[PDB]
Design a protein around this ligand. Structure first.
Ligand code: ZN
Length: 1005
């Protein structure tokens, strides 16, 4: 296994290094506004050195943007694919690429067997070529790598099953910036090449000047270069026809034959090609092709031909095809050009380029880094969509977990198809996969489409719940008794974090009474492959509740009131009728643990009760029903809480973190939480769904006299405050604290609420942010770039550090963030925007809703951690910060038994499961076969992260091949499970390197 910490890789282009020595001057370049006047020596070409031109027709289909998936399908896509089928069949030289398998599967299943067989033949003879073959073309900023893999697997599994094809070339023309997470996943899913488009105009220029637009893209830690994937970056402003033929859109636009209610912004129409004009038109077009070709190293040239929802009408197919045939006919027949031009596919382009490389014509440069933050022109940076519609950004992370848990829980057995497990999981994977779309998780869709994404994720959440509860009941009910009704709710799920009480008071109360119902079974699930002890909580009808395991062993517990926040100013109210019972669940690896909540007359031996202090001016008292410890009152003051041997936090009199003492004999290190506002420019460019165009630095939010609630217990204490827009909360359980913001931006038009941390950590201009929750990349704040250019995606976490200290903020949701000054972290909470940012969405963001954002805050000493070289472009979390991220993304699942009595009940599942090293995760467990298959197969994805070593154990080799019994074989596979890469003679899974991801499939007899 490579070391990923001391060996800095040697690459031709390192984006962080490149960014430092880039001027980013926005020179007007000419006809190519963001580049220069391209010159070629025309004696470059002759009969032995021809230009080979691949014109590749395409149709960019959004699975939701201005219209819903189903709207666009009925209005546009089903016509595009009907016409593709007809026209390609009738025209053997005509070609077409297709990316979005969600739309293709919708179309294909509605065809007759004849059409279906017509479709297969035009895919078989390579006329219709699938590119990437993901369910969607996903967002690359906000998406978790798990969901990128999920949507890829969903698309390519469909393609294998129904087309017997597996694409090896990716097409990513529309995501708003590009992540190295894509080549990472693609290179481990069999891919050989990938195409990208949406990169900063200064980056297109810098690279075009060195002919570094095609590059071997490796990961930022990869010394050897086994992660390398061949990447073509398109050189111009857009993927449309005016921006794909060559450097002068005025010319290129005249070769968009559909534009003869569509016209050319540059006011020169396309003209029908004739014998009259063909020589003149071919000269114009080949001169464009030869200019574009100067930018690349081979004599092979990629010319995309398409745009959004193109190739819809039968006549658009004719007019594009026939005019380009005449051109090719003239051009290929005329030696003075030294061009061979034809319709081709993306794979044909890449094959030809590698034949040129193999034949010694070009050797390609190596690149590491990312392509964030994207700017299409001047100072219009696309950092807004890192935060837009943050409710659904949070919902993505919640549904991410429920799909993993539902797939894992149900994987342990084969189900009779009567149960409809397969159908639920398929619906759930697909709704999650569709939301990965670059107008889904981005929050760049119209209000009604966002509503559709939300209703789809809501259905999906409910399908997961039904699979999870049926699974738990089977796993923990004596087989001698197990006799399931597949349509019955044996458990309801309890989730204290989605949507969050405050977003919707809809957690069930467990009603106990010594006559009516004295005890209740609950079950915790732990999807992680190691032992976990995590405080869980339930709503209960009495405060006199005791916890036991099923062996009646007592478990220590704390009871807190249920608190709610209300508004004239903003104050808490206590329930007189329900309480929180809190206790430490201990759950096996990928396992279940049963506990029992029992009522008594009075304070039970093993249940403590939290105090409640309402730091408010001018008080009026609050009853809490039978809650034994009466709420205390007082005036605003500073407070200091500790829980367990964990940190001691100090707080202002507004209930905002002021400082953290780690250990008992260590200093009170300053750490100020603070809420600010960014607004919108009155003059010039307006912020929207996509763009972050702030009117100068953010300014403080007036807090007034905020009512500060303090709850203090043995197992959990918290400091909550009612701020304008935000109920801010610091929860303590004996380690890194948890931050919760109920964000209600309400009606504050043209406002972005940010949460900043101010420290004395000597970070300088350095901060780290994660990419797709997979890897942490080094950022340098660049004063030469405006504010919005120093904003980066925060899909999982950000951190600053100096010689001695590091502070890491982990997120439960993807959000925008920066370190705009030394020792600071900031992360945007929500944004409301009256104005459109003129990228075609035709609305602002005025559909905000309450969201509960969740964080963990890890202050740490790193002076005794082996930190990577100062030249290394990557950072790595500690164990503490990694486990803190796991507690946000994949917490324990809580189940409440629905019925009075549970005959069969067992207290544990997975006690015998191996407890793998802290840096290893079973990302995916998924059964691949239905019951009516003689060999059961189960797929596992293993990710091993890399944790900073600071010297601290005792675990046990996990081998996923033996997890289920009667293993007849297992294979190392592609991450989609679709290809075998290594027959494993042992039927043992070999161990996995730091930052590596590997898939295995185990077969059972
Ligand atoms: Zn798009």
């Amino acid at each position: 296994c490579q070391d990923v910490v001391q060996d800095v890789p040697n690459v031709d282009v390192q984006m962080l290094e490149l960014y430092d020595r880039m001027s980013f001057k926005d020179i007007d370049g000419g006809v190519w506004k963001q580049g220069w006047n391209i010159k070629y020596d025309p004696l470059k070409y002759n009969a032995h050195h021809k230009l080979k031109v691949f014109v590749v027709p395409h149709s960019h289909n959004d699975p939701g943007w201005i219209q819903t998936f189903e709207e666009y399908y009925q209005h546009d896509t089903k016509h595009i694919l009907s016409n593709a089928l007809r026209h390609l069949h009738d025209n053997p030289e005509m070609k077409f690429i297709w990316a979005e398998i969600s739309y293709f599967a919708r179309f294909y299943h509605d065809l007759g067997e004849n059409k279906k067989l017509q479709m297969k033949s035009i895919v078989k003879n390579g006329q219709l070529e699938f590119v990437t073959g993901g369910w969607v073309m996903p967002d690359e900023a906000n998406s978790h790598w798990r969901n990128v893999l999920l949507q890829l697997t969903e698309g390519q599994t469909w393609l294998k099953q129904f087309m017997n094809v597996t694409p090896t070339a990716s097409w990513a023309i529309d995501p708003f910036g590009h992540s190295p997470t894509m080549p990472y996943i693609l290179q481990k899913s069999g891919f050989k090449n990938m195409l990208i488009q949406r990169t900063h105009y200064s980056v297109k220029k810098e690279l075009a000047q060195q002919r570094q637009l095609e590059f071997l893209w490796r990961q930022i830690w990869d010394n050897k270069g086994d992660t390398a994937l061949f990447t073509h970056m398109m050189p111009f402003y857009s993927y449309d026809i005016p921006h794909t033929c060559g450097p002068d859109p005025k010319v290129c636009c005249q070769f968009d034959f559909k534009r003869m209610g569509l016209s050319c912004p540059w006011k020169v129409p396309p003209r029908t090609i004739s014998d009259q004009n063909v020589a003149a038109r071919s000269d114009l077009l080949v001169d464009q092709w030869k200019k574009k070709a100067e930018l690349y190293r081979t004599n092979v040239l990629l010319i995309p031909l398409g745009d959004d929802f193109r190739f819809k009408q039968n006549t658009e197919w004719d007019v594009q095809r026939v005019n380009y045939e005449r051109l090719f006919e003239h051009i290929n027949s005329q030696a003075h050009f030294n061009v061979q031009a034809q319709f081709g596919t993306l794979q044909e382009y890449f094959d030809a380029v590698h034949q040129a490389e193999r034949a010694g014509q070009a050797e390609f440069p190596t690149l590491s880094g990312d392509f964030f933050t994207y700017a299409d022109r001047s100072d219009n940076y696309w950092s807004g969509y890192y935060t837009s519609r943050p409710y659904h950004k949070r919902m993505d992370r919640v549904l991410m977990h429920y799909v993993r848990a539902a797939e894992m829980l149900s994987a342990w057995h084969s189900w009779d198809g009567m149960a409809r497990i397969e159908e639920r999981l398929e619906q759930a994977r697909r709704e999650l996969s569709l939301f990965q779309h670059h107008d889904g998780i981005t929050g760049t869709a119209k209000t009604h489409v966002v509503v559709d994404y939300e209703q789809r994720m809501q259905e999906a959440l409910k399908a997961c719940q039904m699979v999870m509860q049926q699974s738990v009941y089977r796993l923990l009910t004596k087989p001698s008794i197990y006799s399931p009704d597949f349509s019955f709710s044996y458990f309801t799920l309890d989730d204290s974090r989605w949507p969050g009480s405050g977003v919707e008071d809809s957690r069930t109360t467990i009603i106990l009474g010594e006559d009516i119902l004295p005890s209740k079974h609950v079950v915790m699930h732990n999807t992680l492959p190691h032992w976990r002890e995590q405080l869980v909580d339930f709503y209960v009808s009495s405060p006199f509740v005791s916890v036991t395991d099923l062996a009646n062993n007592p478990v220590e517990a704390q009871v807190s009131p249920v608190w709610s926040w209300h508004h004239d100013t903003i104050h808490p109210q206590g329930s007189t009728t329900k309480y929180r019972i809190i206790f430490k669940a201990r759950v096996p690896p990928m396992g279940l643990a049963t506990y029992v909540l029992t009522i008594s007359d009075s304070k039970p031996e093993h249940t403590s009760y939290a105090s409640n202090l309402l730091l408010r001016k001018n008080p009026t008292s609050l009853p809490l029903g039978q809650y034994p410890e009466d709420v205390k009152f007082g005036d605003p003051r500073e407070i200091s809480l500790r829980v367990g041997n964990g940190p001691t936090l100090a707080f202002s009199e507004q209930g905002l973190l002021k400082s953290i003492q780690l250990t008992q004999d260590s200093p009170h290190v300053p750490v100020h939480f603070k809420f600010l506002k960014y607004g919108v420019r009155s003059h010039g460019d307006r912020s929207g769904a996509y763009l972050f165009l702030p009117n100068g630095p953010a300014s403080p939010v007036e807090l007034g006299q905020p009512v500060v609630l303090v709850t203090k217990g043995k197992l959990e204490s918290s400091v909550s405050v009612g701020l304008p827009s935000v109920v801010h909360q610091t929860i303590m359980r004996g380690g890194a604290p948890e931050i919760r913001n109920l964000v209600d931006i309400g009606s504050l038009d043209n406002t972005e609420i940010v949460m900043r941390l101010e420290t004395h950590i000597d970070s300088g201009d350095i901060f780290y942010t994660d990419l797709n929750g997979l890897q942490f990349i080094k950022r340098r704040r660049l004063d030469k770039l405006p504010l919005q250019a120093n904003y980066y995606p925060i899909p999982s976490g950000m951190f600053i550090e100096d010689a001695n200290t590091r502070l890491t903020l982990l997120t439960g949701q993807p959000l925008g963030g920066s370190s705009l000054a030394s020792g600071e972290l900031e992360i945007m909470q929500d944004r409301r925007l009256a104005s459109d940012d003129e990228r075609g969405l035709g609305q602002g963001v005025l559909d905000n809703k309450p969201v509960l954002h969740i964080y963990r805050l890890v202050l740490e000493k790193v002076n005794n951690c082996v930190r990577p070289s100062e030249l290394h472009p990557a950072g790595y979390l500690t164990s503490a910060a990694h486990k803190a991220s796991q507690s946000l993304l994949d917490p324990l699942d809580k189940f409440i038994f629905a019925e009075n009595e549970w005959i069969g009940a067992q207290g544990q599942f997975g006690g015998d499961h191996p407890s793998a090293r802290e840096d290893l995760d079973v990302s995916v467990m998924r059964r691949l076969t239905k019951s009516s298959a003689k060999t059961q197969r189960v797929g596992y994805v293993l990710h091993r992260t890399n944790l900073m070593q600071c010297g601290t154990e005792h675990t046990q080799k996990l081998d996923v091949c033996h997890l289920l019994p009667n293993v007849a074989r297992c294979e190392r596979t592609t991450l989609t499970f679709l290809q075998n890469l290594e027959h494993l003679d042992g039927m043992v899974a070999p161990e996995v390197c730091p930052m590596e991801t590997a898939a295995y499939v185990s077969s059972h007899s």
